[PDB]
Write an enzyme that holds these catalytic residues in place. Structure first.
Site, PDB file in Angstrom:
ATOM      1  N   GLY A  21       0.838  -1.186   0.000  1.00 18.02           N
ATOM      2  CA  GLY A  21       0.000   0.000   0.000  1.00 18.02           C
ATOM      3  C   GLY A  21       0.878   1.243   0.000  1.00 18.02           C
ATOM      4  O   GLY A  21       2.089   1.204  -0.253  1.00 18.02           O
ATOM      5  N   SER A  22       0.232   2.367   0.236  1.00 20.16           N
ATOM      6  CA  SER A  22       0.917   3.624   0.300  1.00 20.16           C
ATOM      7  C   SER A  22       0.761   4.167   1.686  1.00 20.16           C
ATOM      8  O   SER A  22      -0.232   3.906   2.360  1.00 20.16           O
ATOM      9  CB  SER A  22       0.348   4.622  -0.661  1.00 20.16           C
ATOM     10  OG  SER A  22      -1.021   4.853  -0.378  1.00 20.16           O
TER      11      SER A  22
ATOM     12  N   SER B 203       2.084   7.987   4.016  1.00 19.61           N
ATOM     13  CA  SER B 203       2.442   9.378   3.817  1.00 19.61           C
ATOM     14  C   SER B 203       3.907   9.563   3.411  1.00 19.61           C
ATOM     15  O   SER B 203       4.826   9.315   4.205  1.00 19.61           O
ATOM     16  CB  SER B 203       2.137  10.152   5.050  1.00 19.61           C
ATOM     17  OG  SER B 203       0.754  10.199   5.231  1.00 19.61           O
ATOM     18  N   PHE B 204       4.157   9.978   2.181  1.00 22.30           N
ATOM     19  CA  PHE B 204       5.508  10.224   1.689  1.00 22.30           C
ATOM     20  C   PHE B 204       6.328   8.963   1.541  1.00 22.30           C
ATOM     21  O   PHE B 204       7.549   9.012   1.446  1.00 22.30           O
ATOM     22  CB  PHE B 204       6.207  11.306   2.523  1.00 22.30           C
ATOM     23  CG  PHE B 204       5.428  12.595   2.598  1.00 22.30           C
ATOM     24  CD1 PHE B 204       5.208  13.349   1.449  1.00 22.30           C
ATOM     25  CD2 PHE B 204       4.815  12.973   3.768  1.00 22.30           C
ATOM     26  CE1 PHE B 204       4.495  14.538   1.508  1.00 22.30           C
ATOM     27  CE2 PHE B 204       4.078  14.131   3.840  1.00 22.30           C
ATOM     28  CZ  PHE B 204       3.908  14.907   2.718  1.00 22.30           C
TER      29      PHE B 204
ATOM     30  N   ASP C 120      -3.923  12.451  10.210  1.00 18.97           N
ATOM     31  CA  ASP C 120      -4.362  11.483   9.183  1.00 18.97           C
ATOM     32  C   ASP C 120      -5.191  10.358   9.786  1.00 18.97           C
ATOM     33  O   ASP C 120      -4.975   9.184   9.514  1.00 18.97           O
ATOM     34  CB  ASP C 120      -3.141  10.923   8.422  1.00 18.97           C
ATOM     35  CG  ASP C 120      -3.475  10.204   7.120  1.00 18.97           C
ATOM     36  OD1 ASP C 120      -4.540  10.416   6.570  1.00 18.97           O
ATOM     37  OD2 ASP C 120      -2.563   9.464   6.619  1.00 18.97           O
TER      38      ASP C 120
ATOM     39  N   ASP D  27       5.817   4.498   0.143  1.00 15.80           N
ATOM     40  CA  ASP D  27       5.022   3.311  -0.043  1.00 15.80           C
ATOM     41  C   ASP D  27       5.439   2.274   0.992  1.00 15.80           C
ATOM     42  O   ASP D  27       6.531   2.325   1.558  1.00 15.80           O
ATOM     43  CB  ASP D  27       5.190   2.729  -1.435  1.00 15.80           C
ATOM     44  CG  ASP D  27       4.543   3.612  -2.534  1.00 15.80           C
ATOM     45  OD1 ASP D  27       3.567   4.322  -2.253  1.00 15.80           O
ATOM     46  OD2 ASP D  27       5.029   3.488  -3.680  1.00 15.80           O
ATOM     47  N   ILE D  28       4.515   1.352   1.250  1.00 15.28           N
ATOM     48  CA  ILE D  28       4.666   0.328   2.282  1.00 15.28           C
ATOM     49  C   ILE D  28       4.765  -1.048   1.614  1.00 15.28           C
ATOM     50  O   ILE D  28       3.974  -1.390   0.744  1.00 15.28           O
ATOM     51  CB  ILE D  28       3.476   0.318   3.237  1.00 15.28           C
ATOM     52  CG1 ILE D  28       3.126   1.705   3.773  1.00 15.28           C
ATOM     53  CG2 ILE D  28       3.679  -0.675   4.376  1.00 15.28           C
ATOM     54  CD1 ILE D  28       4.273   2.362   4.476  1.00 15.28           C
TER      55      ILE D  28
HETATM   56  F1  K0B Z   1      -1.224  -7.619   0.542  1.00 10.44           F
HETATM   57  C1  K0B Z   1      -1.666  -7.105   1.713  1.00 10.44           C
HETATM   58  C2  K0B Z   1      -2.680  -6.176   1.706  1.00 10.44           C
HETATM   59  C3  K0B Z   1      -3.052  -5.585   2.897  1.00 10.44           C
HETATM   60  C4  K0B Z   1      -2.386  -5.954   4.061  1.00 10.44           C
HETATM   61  N1  K0B Z   1      -2.520  -5.507   5.359  1.00 10.44           N
HETATM   62  C5  K0B Z   1      -1.613  -6.170   6.109  1.00 10.44           C
HETATM   63  C6  K0B Z   1      -1.478  -5.974   7.591  1.00 10.44           C
HETATM   64  N2  K0B Z   1      -0.165  -5.466   7.967  1.00 10.44           N
HETATM   65  C7  K0B Z   1       0.249  -4.212   7.727  1.00 10.44           C
HETATM   66  N3  K0B Z   1      -0.315  -3.515   6.734  1.00 10.44           N
HETATM   67  C8  K0B Z   1       0.090  -2.249   6.486  1.00 10.44           C
HETATM   68  N4  K0B Z   1      -0.495  -1.602   5.441  1.00 10.44           N
HETATM   69  C9  K0B Z   1      -0.299  -0.169   5.194  1.00 10.44           C
HETATM   70  C10 K0B Z   1      -0.387   0.158   3.719  1.00 10.44           C
HETATM   71  O1  K0B Z   1      -1.597  -0.345   3.141  1.00 10.44           O
HETATM   72  C11 K0B Z   1      -1.638  -1.757   3.292  1.00 10.44           C
HETATM   73  C12 K0B Z   1      -1.661  -2.156   4.736  1.00 10.44           C
HETATM   74  N5  K0B Z   1       1.002  -1.563   7.201  1.00 10.44           N
HETATM   75  C13 K0B Z   1       1.542  -2.284   8.185  1.00 10.44           C
HETATM   76  C14 K0B Z   1       1.256  -3.602   8.488  1.00 10.44           C
HETATM   77  N6  K0B Z   1       1.994  -4.033   9.578  1.00 10.44           N
HETATM   78  C15 K0B Z   1       2.667  -2.972   9.937  1.00 10.44           C
HETATM   79  N7  K0B Z   1       2.448  -1.875   9.151  1.00 10.44           N
HETATM   80  C16 K0B Z   1       3.017  -0.573   9.365  1.00 10.44           C
HETATM   81  C17 K0B Z   1       3.789  -0.315  10.506  1.00 10.44           C
HETATM   82  C18 K0B Z   1       4.322   0.917  10.722  1.00 10.44           C
HETATM   83  C19 K0B Z   1       4.112   1.968   9.813  1.00 10.44           C
HETATM   84  C20 K0B Z   1       4.721   3.239   9.964  1.00 10.44           C
HETATM   85  C21 K0B Z   1       4.525   4.219   9.041  1.00 10.44           C
HETATM   86  C22 K0B Z   1       3.727   4.002   7.939  1.00 10.44           C
HETATM   87  C23 K0B Z   1       3.115   2.796   7.751  1.00 10.44           C
HETATM   88  C24 K0B Z   1       3.304   1.737   8.678  1.00 10.44           C
HETATM   89  C25 K0B Z   1       2.773   0.449   8.463  1.00 10.44           C
HETATM   90  N8  K0B Z   1      -0.889  -7.021   5.408  1.00 10.44           N
HETATM   91  C26 K0B Z   1      -1.362  -6.903   4.107  1.00 10.44           C
HETATM   92  C27 K0B Z   1      -1.031  -7.474   2.883  1.00 10.44           C
HETATM   93  F2  K0B Z   1      -0.077  -8.418   2.835  1.00 10.44           F
END
Ligand code: K0B
Ligand code: NA
Ligand code: NA
EC number: 2.7.11.1
Lengths: 293, 293
Positions: A15-16, A18-19, A127, A21-22
């Site tokens: 996913g995306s 702020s500033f 946000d 992608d994840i």
């Molecule tokens: F194909 C997929 C599709 C969705 C999924 N959701 C998940 C559940 N784990 C986490 N999901 C996310 N997403 C943020 C971006 O949109 C998607 C969800 N950030 C995480 C996660 N676990 C930790 N973070 C995390 C932790 C710290 C952060 C710090 C700053 C910004 C983002 C941050 C994100 N697994 C998925 C998957 F494999």
């Protein structure tokens, strides 16, 4: 395809943020799946290292993800974070886009507290939306986390606690659906705005949609203005018709706060805790998704 | 005696009739591969297989786009070899006794919108959206919907500047009348909206088992197409979609409302159906009706 820090394998984009992608990643030696935020190292407006310092400072807060590593690799600044479970939007979908009142109230208690914690450390989140709250895993399965400090801003000086000044003609930061009315009107965000947005999130879970979704407009800028107009012209007691009065009381409380006021987080939690008690719900922490088979 | 094109390609049975040439199951003897083969008579007045092959090439790498190889003329045919795919949605609809479950319709809808969006992102409109032109993958790609047949496709915008083609009238109906948009029946130049309107008719076909403008007999093609046009125009969307979820009508109304040169909100349209899918309690497990026969 990348290896970060001699330690992590980069996986797919999920996913995306702020500033940045994840991505999923793996601590290769530990066999631990992680989440990874990437920032292009040549960006004109770098901030991932700022965000990393906020995470380091916030560490130890309940429901703040742990930061594992921050560094650089190839063309990117890299921030490796603790992997969490699904977002509240995902869980809302898995629950047929309906939550029980009990689940809404269980969530509200934690979400108010998470916002209070951030504020106690001198920041506002800016946000607040369902996609930025994720459940934990394992022993933390009942814990609601908040993610992403990429839009966060310090609202008071760390040494003196002097609040930032009132400003006008500012830009919206997060998803327009959940923005406060004052954010739409260009006012600098403060503690009250994070909490008003949470109120819209709670009513979104109650209703399945908000009445300012799906509006027509010629451009994105004009769409935001039409969302603003619909929010301003929908009385809280119309928005919240047929739901417990606490949802309106919550929203009116937040809308009433001065720019620099310290919110009464306790009051807001107590509204929902008293309703939970009057409803007779069990204190078992069972959310709706814990019933899925 | 069995048919072999050039020395390399052994033809088996015909598997579909494409807009300007037929598709055969075949073997690439040199490669040791089962393939599909499209043949065009070299003496055709309007040669287009090479044009079509170029469109496929430019689409290459997109999710759900078969790979091709242009093989030029062999004797008195132009030849295009194509990646072999599985059954068409028409074939599967027949296998399923010409009705699909709502879950299957919604699984298909999500992917079909995305395939159309991808084609549009590569600057083309398909112009023959119908169940025969969507095929499932073979084997491990069995849950992926592919789109085929670029014989009627047209570039609708400049690849660099995105300048849109101009509006035109008095256009002959060259595609499939059952799924043609109303504006196509009225002779209007097709654009992105028309591919998506046609997809709306495909989805309602899968829901109903037939459309109300099927089976209208006439002496000539022009008369038959006129009966179809008149039945489409005189059947309100909410009558067509009576007894099915409101999303099907919302989708069709959205498509009919688009301006000739508007960029559709493909995300909105996918979210419309995904929200319904979740409210109905379905899981994205890719278990289609034909999997449970
Ligand atoms: F194909 C997929 C599709 C969705 C999924 N959701 C998940 C559940 N784990 C986490 N999901 C996310 N997403 C943020 C971006 O949109 C998607 C969800 N950030 C995480 C996660 N676990 C930790 N973070 C995390 C932790 C710290 C952060 C710090 C700053 C910004 C983002 C941050 C994100 N697994 C998925 C998957 F494999
Ligand atoms: Na806010
Ligand atoms: Na399947």
């Amino acid at each position: 395809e990348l290896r970060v820090g001699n330690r992590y394998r980069l996986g797919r984009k999920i996913g995306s943020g702020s500033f940045g992608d994840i991505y999923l990643g793996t601590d290769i030696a530990a066999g631990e799946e992680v989440a990874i935020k990437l920032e292009c190292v040549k960006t004109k407006h770098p901030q991932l290292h700022i965000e990393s310092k906020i995470y380091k400072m916030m560490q130890g807060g309940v429901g703040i993800p742990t930061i594992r590593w921050c560094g650089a690799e190839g063309d990117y600044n890299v921030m490796v974070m603790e992997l969490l479970g699904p977002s509240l939007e995902d869980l809302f979908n898995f629950c047929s886009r309906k939550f029980s009142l009990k689940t809404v109230l269980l969530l509200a208690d934690q979400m108010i507290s998470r916002i209070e914690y951030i504020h106690s450390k001198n920041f506002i989140h800016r946000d607040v939306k369902p996609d930025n709250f994720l459940m934990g895993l394992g022993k933390k399965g009942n814990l609601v986390y908040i993610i992403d400090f990429g839009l966060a801003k310090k609202y008071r000086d760390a040494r003196t606690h002097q609040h930032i000044p009132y400003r006008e003609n500012k830009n919206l930061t997060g998803t327009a659906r959940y923005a406060s009315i004052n954010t739409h009107l260009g006012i600098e965000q403060s503690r009250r705005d994070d909490l008003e947005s949470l109120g819209y999130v709670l009513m979104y879970f109650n209703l399945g949609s908000l009445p300012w979704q799906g509006l027509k407009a010629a451009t994105k800028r004009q769409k935001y203005e039409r969302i603003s107009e619909k929010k301003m012209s929908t009385p809280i007691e119309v928005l919240c018709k047929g739901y417990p009065s606490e949802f309106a009381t919550y929203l009116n409380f937040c809308r009433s706060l001065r720019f620099d006021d310290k919110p009464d987080y306790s009051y807001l939690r107590q509204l929902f805790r008293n309703l939970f008690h009057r409803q007779g719900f069990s204190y078992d922490y069972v959310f709706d998704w814990n019933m899925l088979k």
